[model samples]
Target: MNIFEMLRIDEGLRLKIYKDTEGYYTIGIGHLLTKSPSLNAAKSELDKAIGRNTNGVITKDEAEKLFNQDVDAAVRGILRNAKLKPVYDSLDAVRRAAAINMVFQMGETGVAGFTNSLRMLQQKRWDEAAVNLAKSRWYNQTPNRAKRVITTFRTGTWDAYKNL
Candidate 1:
């Protein structure tokens, strides 16, 4: 099953799902999703984050490993997933942010395609980075999580939000 289908099987969080941009399924996390500005990118990022992190059944061990430290790990994961998709190794900031956000959510194993993408970002090879960043659907599939994570990415700095 896909991430959205899986999340729905949980019942509790299932109530949180709703139709979002382009009529895609998304989670309901309080006022965050509807209350924010410039949310498209963030939502796009979140869809990818969940899609990348939970494409298959996510065991507790897997969740723990990927989302270590709860808040801290999640925050970092969001940042990683926020990067571009590494499609062409071009440096599109939003796409890079989405890519990194997925990495942060799914862990390195989830986003192993971006080894070179990371190197490009670190080296400031922007064009190459953008190409790589657009390489996945991590951001496009999980809009809710992407919205939440992109909020963190826009900070230009990471801080404490506990449940972001």
Candidate 2:
């Protein structure tokens, strides 16, 4: 399941490296998922599918398999976090995807570590949650996805699963 290990790199080392490797289009899909703390997996179908480095995008024959791996890892991560579960109670697929996208970008622990952020979520205080989430080091390290997710958080549109 751990896509990075398939690359013949240590999980921790891969994560640290990717954290600094901007424009990771060079690494394969497996590395992309493994580099992300939240989206990481054990040795499973993902590892089997993305066994080694390939190209920019996987072949059509392999794309579906890769998609399944990504989706499975993402859902598993969201469900594992108890805090994010509540917001997922009534959200749609798009919202869920957006939220999980953020989780995938920022590790589960990083998102969960936002205590004040969770409090604001518990109170449904959207703006406060955005402020708290934005101030955290988690937000600072995360690029693109988490930042965009926080903007949604600011408007009270993003679900708790992404924030927590």
Candidate 3:
């Protein structure tokens, strides 16, 4: 089996979006549904499926395909953007992944617009970066996710919110 399949087995695949244990909407191999591309694709595909009389059902394979495509685009956008690269590289993998995930949700240009936040990150000013992130619309719209990501970015640790 492929790695995605292995992960699907480990994470449990759901054909439809559902709230995860932490209450985030997720679907298809534990892929979060909040990110723009993924969420938009899901809605678009649901419309297509409904038009075809499929009752909005999306297959696991199709969802995985969309998820993989969106992730690839997110990563490429982050890597290619000169403005984001410095800040991205300054972060450790866990924090870097959070940044990439934010890019996935906001699009590269959208995240890149957070000039102050990126500057603080590039300067290795973790506390300031966290504060800047908390002050943004992204944080206001998704408080739990923002808190988790900000703490992770500041500490280079998952589950860092408990400490902060």
Candidate 4:
């Protein structure tokens, strides 16, 4: 039910450098190394995360640390959102996690574009929120991921991605 568990399962694990669906160099639980500030910086950060010469691979524990850092960014981004913050705080843990999950995948800016859906969520209308999310191209392209997140909003349970 925790955010980390839900996200780790959804993002999937990659202990070695691999191309993301977008063809970017990614690794360690969805960290897109391709998007790093600089190539050497990426290497330095990776090595630091691994606490050694990773040689393009990371241990699960190292990956977990990186994942925690990524989640922190996502959580902070969501909380700092002026429009999204009110609705975010109004939700329960499951539903709040559903929001964070979306923010992680699409960024807080992307989620902010869902003005109608944000309002729907703010009102605690799960059906409307789900419907609004489905109306997006984000939902169209990543249907399964969207479905699991939407189900969390509707059911208010961790069962979508974990034990109840």
| Clash tally, candidates in order | 61, 2, 0, 0
Q: Mind giving the per-residue lDDT tens digits that candidate 2 earns over 1-164? A: 12222112211222221332444321233335343343244223234456854422345445445545655776687787787777655455444555665555455764667667756655768677777777766566654445656655555443323333
Candidate 1 displacement at residue 148 in angstroms: 12
Best by lDDT: 4
The reply for model 3, stretches above 4 Å from the true place, is 1-55, 160-164
In candidate 3, list every pair of residues with a backbone clash: none
lDDT by residue (tens digit), candidate 3, 24-54: 5566655655534455555555555334433
Candidate 4's C-alpha runs over 4 A off are 35-53
Model 1 Cα lDDT, one tens digit per residue, 18-130: 54434434343211123234446445544454555342233444333323333344345544553533331453444444444454345556666657756766566656655
Residue range with the least summed lDDT across 10 consecutive positions in model 1 = 3-12
Order candidates by lDDT, high to low.
4, 3, 2, 1
Q: What is the C-alpha lDDT profile of model 4 across 44-83, one tens digit per residue?
A: 6667666787767888888888889888988888778788
Worst 10 residues of 4 by lDDT: 34-43
Model 1 has an lDDT value of 0.42
lDDT of 4 at 48: 68
Overall lDDT per candidate, in order of appearance: 0.42, 0.50, 0.66, 0.81
Superposition error at 4 for model 1 (Å): 22
Question: Residue 9 in candidate 4 has what lDDT?
Answer: 78
The candidate scoring highest on TM-score is 4
